Ligand binder design. Structure first.
Ligand SMILES: CO[C@@H]1[C@@H](n2cc(-c3ccc(Cl)c(F)c3F)nn2)[C@@H](O)[C@@H](CO)O[C@@H]1Cc1cn([C@H]2COC[C@H]2F)nn1
Length: 138
């Protein structure tokens, strides 16, 4: 186990068939979780479960370019629960990131940042206890 925030290096960036597995437990009374796939200062893929946006649970996904957030993609399907162990898997595919939580498909996010081999860090932050962050090739 690791104390967030934590940065997982992704040397030489990501590539299709790379499967990133984040294991942890959501804190009690959690407000937010964030994964940030970074290309330098740019965020290629921000994955942001929000436990209380306007008293609703929602997943917000976005990209940050030149320090500006772009168009949000939102999902109401919300597989996280305060206090519970989770597994987030991000599968890098040729045209999107595919996310599954607890072995159930959640969403796809099309690549806005095209230079996958420069997406060289994954930030993990928010209201979690982080057990593990690793990857393999499928
Ligand atoms: C409040 O900031 C968030 C921003 N955010 C979260 C964290 C964050 C830090 C720490 C932790 Cl521990 C953690 F979980 C975290 F989510 N940092 N930045 C990120 O979620 C963003 C996603 O779109 O929305 C907000 C910023 C934003 C949204 N928009 C819209 C208007 O124009 C287009 C749209 F994009 N403009 N700016």
């Amino acid at each position: 186990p690791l104390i967030v925030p934590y940065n997982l290096p992704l040397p030489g960036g990501v590539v299709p068939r790379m499967l990133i597995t984040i294991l942890g437990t959501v804190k009690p009374n959690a407000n937010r979780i964030a994964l940030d796939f970074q290309r330098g200062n740019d965020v290629a893929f921000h994955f942001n479960p929000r436990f209380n946006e306007n008293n609703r649970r929602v997943i917000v996904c976005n990209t940050k370019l030149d320090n500006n957030w772009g168009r949000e993609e939102r999902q109401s399907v919300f597989p996280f629960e305060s206090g519970k162990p989770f597994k987030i898997q991000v599968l890098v595919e040729p045209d999107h990131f595919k996310v599954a939580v607890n072995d159930a498909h959640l969403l796809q996010y099309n690549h806005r940042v095209k230079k996958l081999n420069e997406i060289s860090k994954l930030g993990i932050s928010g209201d979690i206890d982080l057990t593990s962050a690793s990857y393999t090739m499928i």
